[PDB]
Amino acid sequence: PTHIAICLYYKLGETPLPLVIETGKDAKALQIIKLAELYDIPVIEDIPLARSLYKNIHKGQYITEDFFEPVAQLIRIAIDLD
């Protein structure tokens, strides 16, 4: 699609792995990003990673081993910023 947004959630004691809690394309993707900005959630553009997550990891599913390294990197950025 034109726009993709993947919302990732990782919280010690709640999630054993990062969880795709929301996903969206097009209007729904733009929505996610606007709400992210409102709630001061970091937003990072990574086109290959966004595309691969969208295709492979569905809403409510934990990420799989192929995504551990790239997603963990972003989670670490978020922890740093928080």
Binding site: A5, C7, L8, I32, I41, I44, A78
Partner: protein, 38 residues
């Protein structure tokens, strides 16, 4: 989505819904860690 927890809680309220309520876009984004976009 079109259903928010407050609609359920408001339906009940004295009395109050004790059990927790799913799953709104807003609730999910608010607690989220990072958004990855294309």
């Amino acid at each position: 989505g079109s259903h928010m927890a407050s609609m359920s809680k408001d339906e009940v309220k004295r009395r109050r819904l004790h059990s927790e309520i799913s799953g709104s876009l807003a609730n999910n984004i608010k607690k989220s860690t990072v958004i990855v976009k294309n």
